[PDB]
Symmetry: C2
Amino acid sequence: MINFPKPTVEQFFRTYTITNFAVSSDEKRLVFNANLNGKMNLWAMDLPDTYPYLFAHRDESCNFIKFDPENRYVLAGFDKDGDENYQIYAIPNEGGLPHPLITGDASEKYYFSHLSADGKCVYYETSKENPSFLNTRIRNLETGEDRLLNVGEVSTTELAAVSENEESFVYLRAFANTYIVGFVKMGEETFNITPDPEKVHVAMEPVFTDNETIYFATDYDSDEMYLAKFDLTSKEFSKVLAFDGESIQSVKWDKDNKAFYLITVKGVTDILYRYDVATDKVEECSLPVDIIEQIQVAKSGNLYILGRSATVPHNVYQSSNGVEWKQLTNNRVLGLSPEDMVEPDIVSYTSFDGMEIEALLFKAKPENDNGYTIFWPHGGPQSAERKMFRSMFQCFINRGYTIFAPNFRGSTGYGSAFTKLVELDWGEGPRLDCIAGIEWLFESGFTDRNKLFLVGGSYGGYMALLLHGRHSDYFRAVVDIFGPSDLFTFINSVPPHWKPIMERWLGDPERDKERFIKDSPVTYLDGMVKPMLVIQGAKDPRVVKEESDQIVAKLKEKGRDVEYLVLEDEGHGFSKKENEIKVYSLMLAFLEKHQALEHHHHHH
Amino acid sequence: MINFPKPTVEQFFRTYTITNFAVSSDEKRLVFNANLNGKMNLWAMDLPDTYPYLFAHRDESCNFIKFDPENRYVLAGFDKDGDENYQIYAIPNEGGLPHPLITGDASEKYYFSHLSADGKCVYYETSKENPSFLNTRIRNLETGEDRLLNVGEVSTTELAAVSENEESFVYLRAFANTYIVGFVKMGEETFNITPDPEKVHVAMEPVFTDNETIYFATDYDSDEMYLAKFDLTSKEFSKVLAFDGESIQSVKWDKDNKAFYLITVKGVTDILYRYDVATDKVEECSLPVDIIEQIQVAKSGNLYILGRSATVPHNVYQSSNGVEWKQLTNNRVLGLSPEDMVEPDIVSYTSFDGMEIEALLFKAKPENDNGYTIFWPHGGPQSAERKMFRSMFQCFINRGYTIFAPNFRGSTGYGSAFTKLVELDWGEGPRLDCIAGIEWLFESGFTDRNKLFLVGGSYGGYMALLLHGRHSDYFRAVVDIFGPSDLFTFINSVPPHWKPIMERWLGDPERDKERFIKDSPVTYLDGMVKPMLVIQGAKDPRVVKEESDQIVAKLKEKGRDVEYLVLEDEGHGFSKKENEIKVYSLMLAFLEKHQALEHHHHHH
């Protein structure tokens, strides 16, 4: 009847992000962090009523939310403008204004570790007197007394679990993202929790089941993360449950049912399992989305997840049995449904050394298809592109782009060994996996030559710059979103507590000088001749602004076609809607103007 | 445990407004207009799910919302930055971007009147060819055809109801706010719906129950508005149902139960009644709030309202039967409950001629009380101050102010005769009502001399200016929010279609020269010695910018303490949160600094 034009990119601009949530011990309140009003703030629902209200006002990113078990307060962590100098604040149980609780100087960090079961004692890590390795302290909220509990040594040390009786403590000590050693502290004495800490492995997600037992996730002597157990009395490590070709990334003790909920990564999706300890039996549950951001188990055995799909934005869901899910939030893409968006095809190709590489290909719909492709290397590097909603992707797909995102070596979800391959090799193997995937796109016919764009953020921004420098001929245009450009400057500018990890992840500036030169994008500045858009957040602590200033500066001396957008109030990401939309709008205009006119004149 | 500071002012800044709403015919969608994300936009709930999602993006005020009966579209009307040039847009059933439907030049107005029961034909009013009186047209959505239906004559005329068979039409013609004459057009002939249209009276809210029958509210030969019926065949007018000391202001036909829902005004609250036509019986319903803003009756008989109370913000409720209400939305004040806010005491005093004047007194809480009082003349003037939420009041009360809001002569809610007393008397009767209220405050002890601020908006702002001009000694400082300052400029600057009403409401600038001067604030410019803040929206069509510009320009010539805030992107109100907050912040800081220093030195 009325002729409504088809959807435009502006419809994809009004979707918000939910980063995080928590559920009160009695399940009467669920609080979540979302930029529903244009900036990050905590919102609440009085379950079962799902109409949300503002729970606290702050307009900052939030790193954790914790209910008092006796409902006298809510704790949350907030930084400044993407600072990542998170500190700990308290909020009245009914909401209100955050109140400084465990805070200090603007450059200090205060991370929440554990809350005592009586709600009196907060365990946390701080960088204050120990920037490199962090100290572990306790604040007693009744008396105000604050104690040193553990002094970090050797590498970055955090407190990851505490026994009901507050006599036993599990620490995790990170030497790399793939080498994380667990130890228990009991007397003055300490104990490894795997059989051999000299073996490269991760221990994650420890939980006390007794004052004398922990279970946790580890890939000790395996290519996948499995469920292990450690007995503090006998000091016995045991392998309990493993999944063929899947890594456990989440362990949740359902105490009253003596059961675990376990999330695994199987490539580009997450799977949920229930494990009944007593009957040693495993139920395969069903998730309503493909990618889980967070999960919580209430005392009653109810299950709460935060997750998303390719075609479904961040939403929170509730289940009793882990099989039928009530969707609680209703975060949608304006006027559309999953059918209106594109699911990616999972696809694979063979790389230079015979290694099979899995990738996500999002084909533009014929009706929208503009003939161009965006090659998107994900950020990390020890991360992944997965069936996870980014309004960014579907926005570009709406404008008609095909998108290709390969999980180059270094990506997670393909076992421990695959993930280690980017270590000490940021610019050889992964780059060649990308070139190989580009060649595959041409062979496939889903990309035409001279119609390939290149877009990437963070590590992907570095890869965008690196591919630009050394393989310019492939690309029509490049977008670099906070990409490190020089490895010597970058490894010196990361936060101190990342420094001990950087020797194993990246390398050493003096010992590995030659590799560092060869993998730094600024070394190939002369080869960066295609039009380029650079985007950076001034407050970024991971990839500091200087990495984007220097590369833009060096290009501008050579009179190059470079655009540069700085967002004064953001860090490693865009928590404010205004800024997010500004970035989308600019990337779209940039890519549009660098398509070829290809104007056809017909018989008229 | 944790020492939380007491509620601050900034907690009243995060509350949003809901101005208007509609429910689909099948009750499976409810759409409403709100500035929950900082600007006005349509949000929606898939009932019984109440988690809302964005339905249309526009960032503009919305004057109506209308579902298609066959669920192929939603109509809505938007202006530009508080222009009040509303025009008609269509939105897909699922939501999306509004599409120009019945629109034109930026200065033109297109007001929706009626949609045909098949969803084919849209009746509307436009200023285009008849700015003073308006014309009524019809648009066929299947064909694109647009016919002229009626030409406004004599005074400003709208189509208020259309029969099921589209052969009879009720028009309303307004000569004053208290004088609105109804007539019916069938064939080419027209009849009065009241016996004598020479009697000053109002007819309102007509509804066709048959193609031969209408009911409506009117106050013909009465001091209150009552339910009335007019039979189109026999041309019989009947007085059907009246409520002692209450005026009907809304009339809703529940067709399947042959029943009426009627809302009355009884001073400072609204009351809901059900009237069963078959049995001539009245059932008194209960409301979950004191002031109703809008009401729809679904075909199933279910009841939907939007409203508020002194301590409960705008919210939407639903009922099977008008007794037990389900609150659908959760618009709250951040971290607070009703009990944390102040209910006004209902008070009354005798005025200069013995007339009784009702008033709302908000007493500051002992623990907050700063000892000052704010005197607030409401806007309109043929409006009222009522037990209605304004985040503004509770914000000032929290900071420690007592607030007094009298319903001076001209106010609604105390019968037709009372409402007319402001007509041709803006600056005398009501001015003296205010003075008597101020004298009563002093005598009651609830306000001290030298501790009285004055704050008003619209007609309230005119009154603020006048009270300042002729009576400055009563006041520490004054806030004028978009108030007319000079009656000569004002009456010439109002919108074209408001002009016909203006001779009866205000008067004639030649015939009434003397009174216009006596009642213009700007003739008492010399008496405005107290410090004053002035607030104006640039796009305001009711009280144009020039009314505030000129009074500020004149006070500045005499070196007076005047502050002026213009909001470039607002009209006669603050639809955008950023502006509303700037206004509150500035008012609070203005009133603080013009309190007396009151420093107390202690023995320490």
